[PDB]
Structures are given as structure tokens and as C-alpha cells.
Amino acid sequence: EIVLTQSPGTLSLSPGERATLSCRASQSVTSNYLAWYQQKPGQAPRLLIYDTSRRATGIPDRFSGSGSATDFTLTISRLEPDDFAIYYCQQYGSSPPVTFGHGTKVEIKRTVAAPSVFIFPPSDEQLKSGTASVVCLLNNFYPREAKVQWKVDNALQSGNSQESVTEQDSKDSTYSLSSTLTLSKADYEKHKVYACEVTHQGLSSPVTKSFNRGEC
Amino acid sequence: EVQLVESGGGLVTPGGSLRLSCAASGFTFNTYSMNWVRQAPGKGLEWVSSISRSSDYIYYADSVKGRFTISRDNAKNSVYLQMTSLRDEDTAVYYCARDPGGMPTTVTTWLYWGQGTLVTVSSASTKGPSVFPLAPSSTSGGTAALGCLVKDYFPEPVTVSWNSGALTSGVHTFPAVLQSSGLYSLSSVVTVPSSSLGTQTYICNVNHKPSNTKVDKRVEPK
Ligand SMILES: O=P(O)(OC[C@@H](O)[C@@H](O)[C@@H](O)CO[C@@H]1O[C@H](CO)[C@@H](OP(=O)(O)OC[C@@H](O)[C@@H](O)[C@@H](O)CO)[C@H]1O)O[C@H]1[C@@H](O)[C@H](O)O[C@@H]1CO
Ligand SMILES: [Zn+2]
């Protein structure tokens, strides 16, 4: 098989700038049978370029492909917030085994924005079910990097929370993050203070949102 | 208008069999190779198999040879993929794909793609989710937050809308996470001005098609 190595793994640039993506092949690709795809989360791949340099129909001129043999390049000029996606290269000049690269993920850079933080006690409905989930929300922030720590009665938690992050927003290029702490219903009723502590580049000091098990 | 529509995916036990369909329209079907390409959750793309315009040339990836069989009917504008002896490594979104046209061989690159049908290979049983409300409290710069916790379901996917689609601004529906128990979980949140909590009702419309689950939950202040 022909191995395709894409670089860089992740790309972060500002709107209007130029993104240069590399695709290197372990063997020479016959007749420049190399394609480029764009894939946004939740969607099928979008063919941008095939035959190294031929733009697919409807693709703007800001997407240009070049190269030959073992070195291929996709160039995305005048970057839009629409361009948040992973970009794959795909060769088809070999024998039936056609191969794909592992992708270059492109993020749109913007000014630093601190998150707004919210915390949700487990619903009375869920406590009626025998389980307890505590949710901490981070909304409309940038960059993606953020530290979220759970403290139960001031005791730092570990390994009992799972995070999930949204795609970069189409308009303001921000992220939103959720952190869900899981614990038994018995231990939830055995403690009072539940706090979510957030560290982010847009905050001079970490922010803490908390509640006591008797609020309303 | 070129359209490809896959169908037939779902939950299947390891070692089982599943047949996928793909109907096409908007082009002369009988002059095109048809192709199946899959993508495992969180990974890249992998070509599965292709078939020439009149079924004379049939190609497979080594990972599916002797297990998957591709076929087509030009009178029904359909290409099919019969899968047998399914493995965990076969869990993927399966795409129907077509080349840009005028291509020199059966397997090249693909301009048109279907929506894709999700195939989940596991012996875990189907389970619909529980939908718990995330009540708004009493305020960052006048902003409140509410949501719905969609907990413990299998398999993927679930969809979430708010007020039957009327509410879209400020909504953040997070990708699901796989818990240690093997069941999935996700949250869908909305931020709203605090005073809107008294002048508007908020209902999350959760849909888990693999279990025929439709849940509308009214989210209210505690
Ligand atoms: O049989 P396969 O697997 O075929 C592989 C590809 O050649 C086709 O999938 C296709 O892209 C060709 O363009 C198609 O065929 C027309 C030429 O015979 C092309 O027309 P075209 O010149 O592209 O003009 C129109 C089309 O672009 C499109 O708009 C139209 O069809 C919509 O209704 C296009 O339709 O393999 C071929 C190949 O190895 C060789 O031709 O011999 C094999 C015989 O089986
Ligand atoms: Zn690979």
C-alpha cells in the first residue's frame, strides 16, 4: 500500500490568511492521481481537488492544489470561519488499494474570550433513578484549551468526570464545553458543596461556580 | 439533481450479517462505477469496494475480501453491499459514493456522497435514553442556562431540537461520550437572558431512532 502522511496535524490561522497543507506519499503516485477533501463534523466529505490541480465543480479559486510524484500541496487562501474542518488527501493512481491521509485539522484563530460558566445540580428526576450527574458548562470561549476541575466538599476529584466540546462556531469562532461528574446517589446526599473550577487564558484567576445541596 | 441515499444500517451482533442499499438519481447510473466507502467513529476514511458500470469488474479492500459482496441493478439505479461475519472493526458510517465522471478506471476519487448509514457491530442490547432536565438557577451578566441530559443509551445516534426547532440561537448540543458502562450520554444546553425564563417555555425534543424513542421534556426553573 501507498502511505500518505499529512502535515501539520493541526493548523490555527486568522481569517484572510493562507493555509498550506502537505501530503507526502510513500511511493510515487502515478499520473498525479491525488485528491483533496474537506469534511465538516457530521457531514460527508466534500471533494475540493482531484487530479492534483483540477478544482471540483463549484469550488472557489481560493482552493488550489499542486505537486507531483511524492509531494502534494493544498493551499487555502483568504480563510473563512466556514473552513473549520479536517482536510484529507487521497491517492488513486496505485493498484485497487486506494489510500487516505490521516487529515490536517484547521482551526480559525480569533481574539481570546473568557468563558461564561454554569453548574447544574443533578435533577430530582435523576436522583429518583439512583444515579447522580453534575454538569458544568463553559460557553462562548476561545481558545479551546481549558482546565475544568471538580471539588466535592473542597476535595479535588479525579477520573470521575468526562468532557465534551462543540465544533468551532460558524459566526464567532468560539467553543462551548461541558464537564459531567458522575457519582452515586448515596454519596451525592453525603456531601454539601459541589464546585466547578475553570482555568482559561481569558481569566486572570480561576473561576468557581458552586452550589449547596440545599439551594432552590 | 444528483442524489445518493444509503439505507439498511443498524445494530448487529458480532459474526452476523447486514445488507446495505443505495438508491441513486440525477445521472445516467449505467455509465458510472459505484463505490462503498466507510468511516469508523472518530477516524478517517477507508474505501470498501467498487463495481463497474455493468458488473464486469469487482474490487474489494483486503479487510473485507471473502466477507463483503457488492452488486448492482441498473434497472433500479441501486448498488448493494452484503456484509457477513461482521466484526467490531466494521463499525462505521457507510457511504455510497460516485466519481466526478469521465474517470479512467473503476476505482478513483469521489465527488458525490450519500448521507451515510451507521452500522454498529456489538453484542450490547438496544437501550433508549433517559432525559433529565437541567434547570436554570438564579446569572453571568444577565445570562441563564438550561438544558437536557440525555443519559444511558445505545446505540448511536440521538438527535436534539428545542421547541420543535423554533429555538436555535445560543443552543449548544454536545457530541456524545462513551461511559465506562458501554452506554452513551450527551447534553444539549441553551443560554438565554434571565428575564426570558418568565416569558417563554423551553422544551427539548429528544429523538433516539434506534429504539423508537421520542421524548419532549419541559425544562423549568426550580
Ligand atoms: O465501467 P467502469 O467502472 O467506469 C469507470 C468510470 O469511467 C465511470 O464511472 C465514469 O466516471 C465515466 O464517465 C461517465 O461515463 C460517460 C462517458 O462514457 C461520462 O460522460 P461525461 O463525458 O463525463 O459527460 C456527462 C457526465 O459528466 C454526467 O454529467 C452525465 O453522465 C449525467 O447524466 C460519464 O457519464 O470502468 C471503465 C474504465 O475502466 C473504462 O472505461 O472501461 C471500464 C468499463 O467498465
Ligand atoms: Zn490509514
Author numbering:
A (entry chain L): 1 to 216
B (entry chain H): 1 to 138, 141 to 224
How does the study describe this entry?
CPS of Hib consists of polyribosyl-ribitol-phosphate (PRP) repeating units and represents its most important virulent factor. Here we employed a Fab fragment derived from the full-length human CA4 IgG, belonging to the non-A2 family of anti-Hib mAbs, for cocrystallization studies with Hib oligosaccharide DP2 or DP3. Crystals of DP2 and DP3 oligosaccharides complexed with the human Fab CA4 were determined in the orthorhombic space group C2221 at 2.29 and 2.74 Å resolution, respectively, with a single Fab copy in the asymmetric unit. Our study demonstrates that the minimal structural epitope of Hib is comprised within two repeating units (RUs) where ribose and ribitol are directly engaged in the hmAb interaction, and the binding pocket fully accommodates two RUs without any additional involvement of a third one.
As concerns the OS fragments, unambiguous electron density was observed for the entire DP2 length. In terms of antibody-saccharide recognition, the total surface area occluded from the bulk solvent upon the formation of the Fab-DP2 complex is ∼870 Å2 (360 Å2 from the Fab paratope and 510 Å2 from the glycan). DP2 is accommodated in a Fab small groove-shaped binding site delineated exclusively by the H-chain complementarity determining regions (CDRs) H1, H2, and H3. The long 16-residue CDR H3 (according to North annotation) is likely oriented to shield the epitope from interactions with the Fab L chain. The DP2-Fab binding affinity is the result of contributions mainly arising from polar and electrostatic interactions, involving all major saccharide functional groups. The phosphodiester group between A′ and B′ is not involved in relevant interactions with the Fab, while the Ribf B′ interacts with Gly102, Thr31, and Arg53 through its OH-1, OH-2, and OH-5 groups, respectively. H-bonds of the central phosphodiester group A′′-B′′ are established with side chains of CDR residues Arg53 and Thr106.
